[PDB]
Amino acid sequence: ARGFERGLEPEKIIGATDSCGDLMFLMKWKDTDEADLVLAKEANVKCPQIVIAFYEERLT
Amino acid sequence: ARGFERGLEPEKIIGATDSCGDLMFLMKWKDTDEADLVLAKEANVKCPQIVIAFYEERLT
Numbered sequence: 001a002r003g004f005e006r007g008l009e010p011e012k013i014i015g016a017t018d019s020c021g022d023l024m025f026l027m028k029w030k031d032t033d034e035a036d037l038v039l040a041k042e043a044n045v046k047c048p049q050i051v052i053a054f055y056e057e058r059l060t
Numbered sequence: 061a062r063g064f065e066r067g068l069e070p071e072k073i074i075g076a077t078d079s080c081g082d083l084m085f086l087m088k089w090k091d092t093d094e095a096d097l098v099l100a101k102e103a104n105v106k107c108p109q110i111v112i113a114f115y116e117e118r119l120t
Contacts, residue, residue, distance in 0.1 A: 016119065018119075018120075023116065023119070040116065044109065044112050045109075048108035048109065048112060049104065049108065051112055051115075052104050052108060052111055052112065052115070055111075055112070055115035055119075056083065056100070059076070059078075059083070
């Protein structure tokens with residue numbers, strides 16, 4: 001049971017990689033310290049403001 | 061001239077600049093070649109998937 005399947009609230013994306021062919025985000029979930037990979041596509045649609053916060057922080 | 065006030069659908073963000081202290085996007089609107097500066101904060105809320113497509117392309 002991983003990523004969104006864990007049923008937790010998204011908190012913060014801490015990294016991204018397309019190294020596997022598909023863009024994936026490393027998601028920090030609310031009230032756990034076990035982070036997981038989720039598809040960018042699914043995060044884009046389910047928590048778009050959290051995705052944007054990640055990209056805006058990455059701009060500087 | 062007016063940006064979102066023009067009542068056009070966002071097509072794509074051409075680029076982004078913080079050169080004014082606030083993050084701004086240069087927005088291409090559908091069916092117009094007149095691009096406009098809009099606040100990132102406003103695009104984030106009104107057309108988040110257009111913002112994300114811009115950032116995803118820039119990540120490559």
